[PDB]
Amino acid sequence: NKRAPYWTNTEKMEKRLHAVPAANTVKFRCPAGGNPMPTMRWLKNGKEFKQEHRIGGYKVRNQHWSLIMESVVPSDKGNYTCVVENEYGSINHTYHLDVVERSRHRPILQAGLPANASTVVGGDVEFVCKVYSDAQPHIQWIKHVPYLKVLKAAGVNTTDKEIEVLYIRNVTFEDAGEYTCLAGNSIGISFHSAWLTVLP
Amino acid sequence: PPGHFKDPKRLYCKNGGFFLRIHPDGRVDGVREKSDPHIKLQLQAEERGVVSIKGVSANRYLAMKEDGRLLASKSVTDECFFFERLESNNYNTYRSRKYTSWYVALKRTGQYKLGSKTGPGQKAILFLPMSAKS
């Protein structure tokens, strides 16, 4: 019963794009059969994949027709092709790998923002806040009047698009005080404060 | 690391490797084509740890109904909010704030999975947010 190589489990091969978080292990499989037992070779971006091509190299388990790369990093991104063959034929399949770096930190604000501001009564002023966060952050502006008052809060109606800048027009002496940009995500809460000074 | 929270994103499901897709007509499913215009989504926090997911093109918000069915409505309701959690394996999960035990999920076939059939250790509930560019 001599025959060319063939995929013995196409179910495990349907997932073509493997997008994984950095530091995880990636395993590509191309379960094959054939008589004689076909050989297996792996290519990265159409070229031979050598151990020296990545830190720590890679591992291959012939019994499982698999290619294993541990602790992936952004540079592992690319196409990986398995080429299986015997004297009666040659077949290949290609997977694409993408690596995404995750950050498990509470929101981080830029030092200096918002900045203190001063103006004469009747004037206009703004407070800006720049946030970095992987877990979706929730931003809001608060005035200390600890008795606090929410002046603006992100949401479906107040998109992040314009939540980062707080405008205070026709400032009165009542507007004077401490303003806070508070950013929170599932991991934690961060905030930076600025002071508004109003002059006669 | 590279990226920004207010930028639209694609939500990649580890199960089968499908991108969450929100159709103009409200249908929700998954596809593998990175070029598809209905997989570009906008995440927005309504409060700490809670977000709404909007299909930009479809201009509809993802939502989970009383029976665990997924779909997207033109108007935002309490069924459009999900607790976003970053699991230890570094993938995200989206659990309904209204139906607190059901997760957003995709089956290996590319169709959504009933919320009522989801659970914390399933591959179907694991998503990875990715840039909506190129």
DSSP string, A139-185: EEEEEE---EEEEEE-SSSS-GGGTSEEEE-S--GGG-EEEEEEEE-
Confirm if A38 and A6 have CB atoms less than 8 A apart. no
CATH code for residues B1-134: 2.80.10.50
Assess whether A107 and A189 both reside in one domain. Answer: yes
Assess whether A21 and A113 both reside in one domain. Answer: no
Given A101, A121, A153, the domain boundary residue is A101
Residue whose entry in the numeric block shows the structure tokens 């999900």: B82
Full domain range(s) for residue A144: 102-196
Beta strands at A26-29 and A66-69: parallel, antiparallel or unpaired: antiparallel
Assess whether A72 and A89 both reside in one domain. Answer: yes
SS3 for B124? helix
Instruction: Please answer yes or no on whether B86 and A135 come within 8 Å at the CB atom.
Output: yes
Going B49 to B45 to B84 to B119, the CA torsion angle's sign is: positive
Around Cβ B73, how many Cβ atoms within 10 Å? 14
- Burial (CB count within 10 angstroms: exposed 0-12, middle 13-18, buried 19+), residue A5: buried
Instruction: Please answer yes or no on whether A21 and B49 come within 8 Å at the CB atom.
Output: no
Candidates A20, A131, A159; nearest CB to B44: A159
Record the tokens describing residue A84, joined without a space. Answer: 């299986």
Assess whether A149 and A78 both reside in one domain. Answer: no
Q: A with B: how many residue pairs have Cβ under 8 Å apart?
A: 93
Q: Which amino acid is at B14?
A: K
Assess whether A1 and A97 both reside in one domain. Answer: yes
Total domain count, chain A: 2
How far apart (Å, rounded) are the C-alpha atoms in residues A72 and A52?
15
Assess whether A91 and A114 both reside in one domain. Answer: no
Given A101, A121, A141, the domain boundary residue is A101
- Write the CA distances from A53 to A60, A70, A83, B20, B47, integer angstroms: 15, 13, 18, 33, 45
The order of strands in the sheet holding A66-69 is A26-29, A66-69, A59-61
The CATH number assigned to the domain holding A188 equals 2.60.40.10
DSSP β-bridge partners for residue A37: none
- Which residues of chain B make contact with A104, given a CB cutoff of 8 A? 86, 90
Confirm if A95 and A28 have CB atoms less than 8 A apart. yes
Residue whose entry in the numeric block shows the structure tokens 């490797």: B17
Which residues in chain B have their C atom more than 2.5 Å from the N of the next written residue, marking a break after them? none
How far apart (Å, rounded) are the C-alpha atoms in residues B5 and B92?
14
Show the CA angle centred on residue B4, arms to residues B49 and B89, nearest 5°.
55
Assess whether A184 and A135 both reside in one domain. Answer: yes
How far apart (Å, rounded) are the C-alpha atoms in residues A104 and A135?
7
Assess whether A94 and A117 both reside in one domain. Answer: no
